[PDB]
């Protein structure tokens, strides 16, 4: 009868598809004609795989079950023999080291502590065959060149539940490296080679460093050509003096030339976008470092998952190569569906029309055109962003935007104000070197400030502008037209666009209003982020994102208050609502309009208020500093679709916001916002998740050094909003 | 999942290909030779039988069962 189905059950601890692959590799596939005696042999084969997966006492029940006419269903059930556990690892021949010093370099473990469940000790016949290479390396790394594995033995208990590992080795001796000598054709790069081969005479031999010598010799010759050089570090042995002489033959092949540079897997992103970032040219000799710089600059564009490379030798030619970069795009919405699915959520700018149109690639002229929507509680914002990051392929970017936003304040947890504002930003990007670029540009901005509830700071501002309004009521307004010069210096060694692991970003964005503007002032922002890894897998990373802010007017005039820095929020200081950090609203007592008792018209004389009053609402300030120091971590137990790595972190948010123009001497009955002191601290954990329909972030924290009147709150998040 | 009578032919798109210019028979004078053509990108010439596009079927044939 035909196998109409194979029914599987009882593989508690064994991966499911391996069973099907075993059966089909052994014959008697689905649909095949079953000889009924052969079910015993099929059972035996399944058990033999249960040998392969380390369950040497397993057994299987295979009930062949009739089905209509020529059909059967084979109902397998698997008796899960206990997984073979390593009881111990033992080594024979030691005098230099105890077992632990060796086992610490294994993946395999002998013991799992009573105080924590560290990685666990199930055996695999092909785990040890790899792990022993680490022991062999270790003795060679410690310079025991004459080391050898005498033999490898692994053994089982008579009841076949337990594994015992036996390692027989010869220690030899930790011979000294006497020197290094290269031979063969070095293509005249000998002087550099000598500096690669720099060692200290009489030191212990070091196998790992010899391997590094081979690799870095390869890489050096890569920096001149030579995609395929041979390196032969087979050394001379001097048993009499107890030393080893590192002869290294080297084979500098050719000045390989890059016939082609393809991009593969690239879709929905035009060739010009990627190829421009290359540094290895077509029709030129290979510099492998240049290809790797290409790998980085592609990785840095934020367009991809896992950019990958190849250096195929051309068929039929000895000395030309293809260079091929494989890429998978980040599915950041721009390719399919409808434009960026512009629905989002949050409490920061608010629940948001977070929308984006991108890569309209207008009329083929070589500019991207787009529109970004940001309608929420916090602002009524939208923009027409036109940009080419390489307007001039020499490297100069050009772009700009008009934008309108009637900024809404107490909806943003600030003092009551509203400001019908707009402006146009025009900027160029001057790249400076291999890694650094310099933003510069001009811009006109308009403001129509209104709904000004009386509170000291703006009245410092309006006073400095000659406006001395009464503190009577909120129905006061002001407007300005200002021309601005804006710039940003930007170091970037970030290893990858989303979720960095190494290098750093600096962003020293500063701008100033030029003479002829209504208000003369400048503001300077130093955004910064440094990533340093602690694991070679680059899943554990020390990240410091840091910020500083400062500004002043011409001749001591006040800067526009709404240009104050702000802090709080998931981005800047986690664990405090939106912008609550720093100086608060301090109203004058006033005749509040549209009075009703259901309204918290704070400091209103309507309620009987008499004098200047404090509240938790923020106003921000000209001066700021922030330091979020945090340990990025691998995600917990969820790594099945691991390549699109979701990220998690442990963090500690330091920061402060204040006003150097705050006149404490005039208002000593109220907080001393004149001083940077009272630096906040908050700590917590965060989650960042890559949905294709708009990535997400979550954060929860304890404000460990809270201060007066802060709107502290333990949790924040967003939806559909990468930034 | 439900499709009308001519969703059965469209390709997630339509025959933007069919409205295209013919091949250019590039020629050069004496002294010139246009470099030898790779057969990897030759296109044979045929009698033009049958319809094209969605006017031509892609429903799989049926062999003697």
């Amino acid at each position: 009868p035909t196998i109409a189905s194979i029914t599987f059950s009882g593989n508690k601890s064994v991966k499911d598809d391996m069973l099907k692959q075993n059966l089909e590799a052994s014959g008697v596939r689905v649909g095949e004609s079953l000889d009924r005696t052969t079910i015993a042999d099929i059972e035996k084969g399944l058990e033999d795989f249960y040998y392969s997966v380390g369950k040497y006492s397993a057994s299987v029940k295979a009930v062949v079950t009739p089905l209509p006419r020529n059909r059967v269903d084979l109902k397998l059930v698997f008796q899960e023999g206990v997984s073979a556990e390593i009881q111990q690892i033992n080594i024979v021949g030691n005098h230099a080291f105890t077992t632990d010093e060796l086992i610490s370099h294994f993946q395999l473990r002998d013991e799992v502590p009573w105080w924590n469940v560290v990685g666990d000790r199930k055996y695999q016949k092909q785990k040890l065959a790899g792990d022993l290479e680490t022991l062999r390396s270790y003795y060679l790394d410690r310079g025991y060149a004459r080391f050898n594995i005498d033999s490898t033995q692994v053994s089982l208990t008579p009841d076949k539940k337990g594994i015992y590992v036996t390692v027989n080795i010869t220690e030899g001796d930790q011979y000294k490296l006497s020197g290094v000598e290269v031979s063969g054709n070095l293509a005249g790069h000998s002087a550099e080679i000598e500096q690669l081969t720099k060692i200290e005479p009489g030191e212990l031999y070091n196998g790992t460093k010899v391997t590094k010598m081979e690799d870095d010799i390869k890489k050096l010759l890569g920096r001149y050509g030579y995609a395929y050089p041979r390196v032969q570090s087979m050394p001379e042995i001097n048993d009499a003096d107890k030393t080893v002489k590192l002869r290294v033959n080297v084979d500098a092949g050719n000045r390989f030339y890059v016939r082609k540079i393809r991009f593969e897997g690239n879709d929905t992103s035009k060739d010009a976008v990627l190829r421009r970032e290359m540094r290895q040219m077509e029709g030129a000799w290979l510099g492998s470092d240049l290809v790797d710089q290409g790998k980085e600059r592609l990785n840095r564009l934020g367009f991809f998952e896992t950019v990958d490379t190849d250096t195929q030798r051309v068929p039929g030619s000895p000395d030309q190569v293809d260079v091929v970069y494989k890429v998978k795009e980040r599915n950041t919405g721009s390719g399919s569906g409808s434009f960026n699915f512009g629905i989002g959520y949050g409490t920061e700018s608010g629940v948001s029309f977070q929308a984006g149109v991108q890569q309209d690639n207008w009329l083929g002229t070589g500019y991207a055109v787009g529109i970004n929507g940001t309608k929420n509680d916090y602002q009524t914002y939208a923009e027409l962003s036109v940009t080419n990051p390489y307007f001039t392929v020499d490297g100069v970017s050009l772009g700009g935007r008009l934008f309108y936003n009637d900024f809404q304040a107490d909806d943003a947890d600030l003092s009551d104000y509203t400001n019908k504002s707009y402006g146009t930003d025009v900027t160029l990007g001057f790249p400076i070197n291999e890694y650094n670029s310099l933003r510069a540009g001009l811009g006109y901005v308009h403001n129509s400030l209104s709904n000004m509830q009386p509170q000291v700071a703006m009245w410092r501002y309006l006073y400095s502008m000659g406006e001395h309004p009464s503190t009577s009521d909120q129905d006061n307004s002001f407007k300005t037209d200002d021309f601005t010069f804006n710039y940003g210096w930007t170091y970037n060694k970030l290893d990858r666009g989303y979720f960095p692991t190494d290098g750093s970003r600096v962003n020293l964005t500063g701008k100033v209003t030029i003479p002829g503007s209504d208000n003369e002032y400048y503001k300077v922002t130093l955004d910064t982020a440094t990533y340093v890894p602690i694991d070679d897998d680059h899943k554990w990373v020390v990240l410091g994102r840091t910020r500083w802010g400062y500004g002043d007017g011409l001749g001591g005039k006040e800067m526009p208050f709404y240009e104050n820095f702000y802090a709080g929020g998931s981005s800047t200081v986690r664990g405090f609502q939106s912008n609550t950090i720093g100086p608060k609203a301090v109203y004058f007592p006033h005749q509040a309009s549209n009075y009703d008792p259901d309204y918290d018209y704070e400091c209103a004389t309507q309620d009987g208020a008499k004098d200047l009053c404090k509240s938790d609402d923020a106003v921000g300030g000209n001066a700021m500093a922030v330091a979020s120091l945090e340990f990025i971590t691998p995600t917990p137990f969820i790594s099945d679709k691991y390549a699109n790595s979701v990220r998690t972190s442990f963090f500690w948010d330091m920061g402060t916001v204040w006003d150097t123009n705050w006149d404490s001497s005039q208002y000593s009955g109220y907080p001393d916002y004149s001083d940077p002191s009272n630096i906040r601290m908050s700590a917590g954990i965060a989650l960042q998740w890559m949905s294709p329909l708009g990535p997400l972030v979550f954060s929860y924290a304890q404000p460990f050094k809270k201060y007066d009147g802060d709107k502290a709150e333990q949790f924040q998040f967003n939806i559909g909003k990468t930034w | 999942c439900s499709s009308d009578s001519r969703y059965k032919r469209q390709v997630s798109g339509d025959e933007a290909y069919l409205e295209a210019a013919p091949l250019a028979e590039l020629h050069a004078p004496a002294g010139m030779i246009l470099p030898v053509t790779s057969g990897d990108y030759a296109i044979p010439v045929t009698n033009g039988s049958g319809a094209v596009g969605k006017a031509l079927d892609i429903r799989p044939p049926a062999q003697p069962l």
């Binding site: 000045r255 000799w285 490297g395 790249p431 | -």
Partner: protein, 91 residues
């Protein structure tokens, strides 16, 4: 202006040295030419078998410079001409 802003170094064509170029002699043959200089990144597609080697560099947006070495063989593959022309005045 170009000089205002960065560019990466742009290399083109074959690497060359006075040592290796000197290895090309009249009467040389193509495979031995390949052993001397490697395959040229260019060859005349329009008829006569002449190979072009170009050591051309445009560092730091200053002084694009090259040696252009033109080689010609008869159709049987034996070299008939050499022209190691240096660069014209650049900008």
């Amino acid at each position: 202006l170009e000089r205002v802003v960065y560019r990466p170094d742009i290399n083109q064509g074959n690497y060359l040295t006075a040592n290796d170029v000197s290895k090309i002699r009249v009467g040389m043959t193509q495979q031995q030419v390949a052993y001397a200089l490697g395959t040229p990144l260019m060859s005349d597609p329009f008829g006569t078998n002449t190979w072009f080697y170009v050591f051309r560099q445009q560092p730091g947006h200053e002084g694009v410079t090259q040696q252009t070495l033109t080689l010609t063989f008869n159709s049987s593959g034996v070299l008939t001409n050499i022209d190691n022309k240096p660069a014209l005045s650049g900008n």
